[PDB]
Amino acid sequence: NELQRKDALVQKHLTKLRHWQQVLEDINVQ
Amino acid sequence: NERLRALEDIEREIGAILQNAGTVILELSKEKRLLDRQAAAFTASVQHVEAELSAQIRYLTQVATGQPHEGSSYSSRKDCQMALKRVDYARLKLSDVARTCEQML
Questions:
Q1: Closest by Cβ to A27, choosing from B87, B97, B104
Q2: If you write DSSP's letter for every residue of B31-60 in order, what string do you get?
Q3: For the range A2-11, what are the long-range contacts, defined as Cβ-Cβ under 8 Å and sequence gap of 24 or more?
Q4: After which residues is chain B broken (C to N over 2.5 A)?
Q5: Is A10:B101 a contact under the CB 8 Å cutoff?
């Protein structure tokens, strides 16, 4: 159960970071 | 854009029809069509161009001694590019963290 929860939290954090960095791709249009 | 538009207008009106008006008096070769070209583009265009040139000549004449019309010359525009560099470094770090996460799969 602990390993499952850790994997779930890791996947959630990875998806959140992915979504975050993805939208601020070309913030500076230049 | 005021001075830029004025310069563009002066350039577009530099090549007036006054230089080409030297063939207007010979238009009367049919009786003792476009005879109107000998009136509007004979000397009035040149007069208006000269008036515009004289007006443009009599400007404020700001530049007197040194280097006027400055305006960048200075601060954190540099630091603006530096903040762009920080954004790029954060991008690199996020990419490294994403690679680590992918390896964690």
A1: B87
A2: ----TTHHHHTTTHHHHHHHHHHHHHHSS-
A3: A10/B101, A10/B104
A4: 32
A5: yes
Tracing tokens 């509007």 back to the chain, one arrives at: B40
Q: Do B97 and A28 touch (CB under 8 A)?
A: no
**Assigned token pair, B11:** 């350039």
Return d(Cα B105, Cα B99) in angstroms, integer: 10
Q: Taken in order B12, B13, B15, B21, is the CA torsion positive or negative?
A: positive
Longest Cα–Cα distance of chain B, Å, equals: 101
Residues B63-97 as b or e (16 or more Cβ within 10 Å = b): eeeeeeeeeeeeeeeeeeeeeeeeeeeeeeebeee
- Rounded to whole angstroms, the Cα distance separating B37 from B17 reads 9
Q: Would you say how long chain A is, in residues?
A: 30
Residue B71: strand, helix, or coil: coil
Final resolution, Å: 4.7
1-30 of A, contacting B, C-beta below 8 A: 10, 13-14, 17-18, 20-21, 27-28
The C-alpha atoms of residue B65 and residue B42 are separated, in whole angstroms, by 42
